[PDB]
Design a protein around this ligand. Structure first.
Ligand SMILES: COc1ccc2nc(C)c(O[C@@H]3C[C@H]4C(=O)N[C@]5(C(=O)NS(=O)(=O)C6(C)CC6)C[C@H]5/C=C\CCCCC[C@H](NC(=O)OCC5(C)CC5)C(=O)N4C3)nc2c1
Ligand SMILES: [Zn+2]
Length: 197
């Protein structure tokens, strides 16, 4: 039967984290490929969640998610409308705004949120899925220029990750990147002013 064969789309799965609790940033994997695919279909994730920045994956893409104001935020172009796997089953999004490329689930038990920056700083720091901390000069409300342009491959898969001020508050989450001949020159981010329900 056609309708009996209609499958359901998988959940987003936390597969790691970017640890920013010490003086080095470093990436941690908490789930391998097979475990990720299984957890995506069931939506049941019993792993203990920690930290502010999570590495997340669907069946087909991997990116980042950042907890701010008690909500785990990420980009719509990565997560779509998908639920997220949790200890008590799949969890539906708290917030969905395709016009901001922004979605949110209630933050996991055991996670912590970053503080929204109120500094009005223009010296920003983008955290990548590889735990690189990339200086960025803020341009206006939602853009920034890389101080040292790198290859665009260095940024791929880091959408949903945080841009932080010098003191470590959250200024926004990484949304898109602008390149010129394959070198990343600037980024766009969702201002933290929007990461609140
Ligand atoms: C379908 O429903 C929606 C709704 C709203 C929405 N809004 C977007 C802005 C958007 O854009 C697409 C995804 C995005 C990223 O790639 N985002 C990351 C990233 O890494 N994603 S990812 O790898 O994690 C992934 C795909 C999740 C798994 C962070 C960059 C890093 C490298 C970019 C690679 C080349 C791409 C250059 C491109 N540039 C740009 O569009 O600039 C525009 C501007 C600012 C005006 C000039 C770009 O950034 N994107 C393409 N799709 C949508 C889709
Ligand atoms: Zn600040």
């Amino acid at each position: 039967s056609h309708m009996a064969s209609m499958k359901k789309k998988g959940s987003v799965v936390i597969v790691g984290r970017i640890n920013l609790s010490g003086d080095t940033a470093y990436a941690q994997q908490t789930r391998g490929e097979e475990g990720c695919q299984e957890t995506s279909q069931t939506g049941r994730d019993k792993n203990q969640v920690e930290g502010e920045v999570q590495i997340v994956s669907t069946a087909t893409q991997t990116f980042l998610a950042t907890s701010i104001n008690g909500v785990l935020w990420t980009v719509y172009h990565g997560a779509g409308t998908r639920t997220i796997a949790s200890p008590k089953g799949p969890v539906t999004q708290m917030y969905t705004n395709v016009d901001k490329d922004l979605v949110g689930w209630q933050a996991p038990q055991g996670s912590r949120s970053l503080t929204p920056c109120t500094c009005g700083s223009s010296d920003l720091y983008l955290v990548t899925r590889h735990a690189d901390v990339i200086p960025v000069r803020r341009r206006g409300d939602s853009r920034g220029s890389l101080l040292s342009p790198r290859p665009i491959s260095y940024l791929k898969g880091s959408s949903g990750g945080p841009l932080l001020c010098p003191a470590g508050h959250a200024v926004g989450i990484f949304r898109a990147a602008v390149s010129t001949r394959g070198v990343a020159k600037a980024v766009a981010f969702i201002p933290v002013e929007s990461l609140e329900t």
